[PDB]
């Protein structure tokens, strides 16, 4: 039986724009911490929330920066840990909110341990219950990505090592994370190695890609985003040119070894949705076909304001199909954006820009790579700056 | 709080029934298990009963011991039949949460003798 524990108006500091946004938040006994634009009782409950948080295992801190009566909460949004800053008008109101959130959080821990006692099986009642000895160090790629060769099988991989401070996804155009282990001070990620280089530097050397070449890269990106959305129910969030690499044959490999990419809804502090991936596709394909970003300015205040308020100009070299695709992908309202509807990736797949493309053939790597990397071997690091 | 009782001195071939009386916690909604600790051996699991009532038993007690729950009394029983001297130990009862926190009651001593001295 879910019930509201506390509700009221909070000022939530913007994560990218220097502002405080008034929101009506509901704290419920299941830990849900849900923010609306208006009170649900004033709009007949017919409006979706803007923010969906969970105060399970949260951390709370009261502070007087930037404003008095501020508190910071480190909580969760579905699977991601986030940090949000709130403001209220009096110290008593802040004490009520921090106490109410903490009381709900403590009640959730007791419910959890009650649930583990009820679901404990016979094996759980017993009295008691990969490593770097494998893999060979070879070279370095990032600033700390290293190139390794598995001692047992003789296969090459790229090991990402991080000091302590998308696992089961398999797709031809996604980098597969094969192994994952840790030490007392480090986290290790053994993932496949695409030695064809970053598209960021390939586009930088070519200045601009043709519409055919961009259609090749875009189609393979769409294929991977369709798999993540429909099969894994995951938003990639980080689709950008720097996270796009090529394998030895010139096919896309989305990897994970930039304020200019932020979607309008993220700049306005709404929760991420599927449509942010299609915005990111619009930005990368605009870069590929125009040789520059749709919005850019050194002053990040100007840049965010261009993204939110100004029209995208397209060069006269862009064909009408290309302009229609980019205009649809770069709609500022995610509900109007191409791919923001219920059919998601099928909206892009059926767009005239991709006419004649058999999307099963894209998955099967039957498209002709317009550029073949000249890598001599799988140890050739010529494409890593 | 869990209180074991029902132990004592019994002869080989006799029987006993131990009781695990709970106060403050609800065994009706918790997986409950029985344990024993021999003089110089490692503490071992013997039997468990799930919330549904399904029971599982370890090898040395199969066909001899029976674990049951009394929801009305908030108590879990261990019926010990076919007792032999090797069953001599202090017996304990616990939930999962208390098990991982090493929170144990006092237990009840069970001594199975081959004969009266």
Author numbering:
A (entry chain A): 3 to 131, 138 to 151, 156 to 177, 195 to 286, 305 to 432
B (entry chain B): 3 to 119
Paper text:
Akt is a serine/threonine protein kinase essential for cell growth, proliferation, and metabolism. Akt comprises an N-terminal lipid-binding PH domain with specificity for PI(3,4,5)P3 and phosphatidylinositol-3,4-bisphosphate [PI(3,4)P2] and a C-terminal AGC kinase domain characterized by the presence of a regulatory tail at its C terminus. Recruitment of Akt to PI(3,4,5)P3 in the plasma membrane promotes its phosphorylation by phosphoinositide-dependent kinase 1 (PDK1) in its activation loop (T308) and by mTORC2 in its hydrophobic motif, rendering it active against substrates. Akt exists in an autoinhibited conformation in the cytosol of unstimulated cells, characterized by an intramolecular interaction between its PH domain and the substrate-binding cleft of its kinase domain.
Using a llama-derived nanobody as a crystallization chaperone, we determined the structure of near-full length Akt1 (residues 1 to 445) to 2.05 Å resolution. The nanobody, which we refer to as NB41, binds to a short sequence of the engineered interdomain linker, thereby stabilizing the linker conformation and mediating essential crystal lattice contacts. The structure reveals an autoinhibitory assembly in which the entire PIP3 binding site on the PH domain is sequestered in an intramolecular interface with a region of extended polypeptide chain between the APE motif of the activation loop and helix αF of the kinase domain, which we refer to as the APE-αF loop. The interface surface area of 507 Å2 is stabilized by one polar cluster involving seven ordered water molecules and one hydrophobic core: D323 to D325 of the kinase domain interact with K14, R23, R25, N53, and Q79 of the PH domain, and L316, V320, L321, F358, and L362 of the kinase domain associate with Y18 and I19 of the PH domain. An additional interaction is provided by a cation-pi interaction between Y326 and R273 of the kinase domain, which positions R273 in hydrogen-bonding distance to T82 of the PH domain. In our structure, the PH domain is rotated ∼23° with respect to the structure of Akt in complex with allosteric inhibitors, leading to an overall root mean square deviation of 9.04 Å over the whole PH domain, indicating that allosteric inhibitors severely distort the autoinhibitory interaction between the PH and kinase domains. In the absence of the C-terminal 35 amino acids, which comprise the turn motif (T450) and the hydrophobic motif (S473), density was not observed for the glycine-rich loop (residues 154 to 157), αC helix (residues 180 to 196), or the activation loop (residues 289 to 306), though inspection of the structure reveals that there are no barriers to the αC helix or the glycine-rich loop from adopting their known physiological conformations in the presence of the C terminus. In the structure of autoinhibited Akt1, E17 forms a salt bridge with R86, which stabilizes the loop conformation between strands β1 and β2 that packs against the kinase domain.
